[PDB]
Amino acid sequence: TQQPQQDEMPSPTFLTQVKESLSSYWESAKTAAQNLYEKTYLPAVDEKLRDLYSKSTAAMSTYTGIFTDQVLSVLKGEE
Template sequence: MNKLLVITVLVALLAINAESFRVVRQVDEEPGTLTKLTDAVKSYYDGAVNAASGYLESIKGMKLEEKAKTLYSDTTNVVSTYAGIMNDQIYHIFYPQQ
């Protein structure tokens, strides 16, 4: 009786394992309209991202960031100088020397 039970369990396990090893048949289907559209959108998006990355790399090569920093510092120096002159002129308009 015990041998029969063991053989039955082994056969059941073998049947379950054999069923899980079935190979799924691959069917070559033509992609649908939605798949074609999403692929086209993805390709356009990837192209745009690559173009933008290329532009950013070329801009970094021109060292525009450093030029912008120097332009900002020069501009603030000039504006602060002229603001000081205007402040001085306005002060002398309201408080003339006697």
């Protein structure tokens, strides 16, 4: 089960929560473990690659400028 935090960004409360996020992660993590074996036989590795690439073209185009936004911002403060 995920935690419905108010602040979207890694706020003080969100950071502290991180610990609990690991427990809820393992819950469904097991399915992934067996799935590892699943995707072994199937050659979806190459498909999902380009698959996520196409979607990320528009999606990542926002988080790219956004992510680098605060990064560049730290350039002035640090340097």
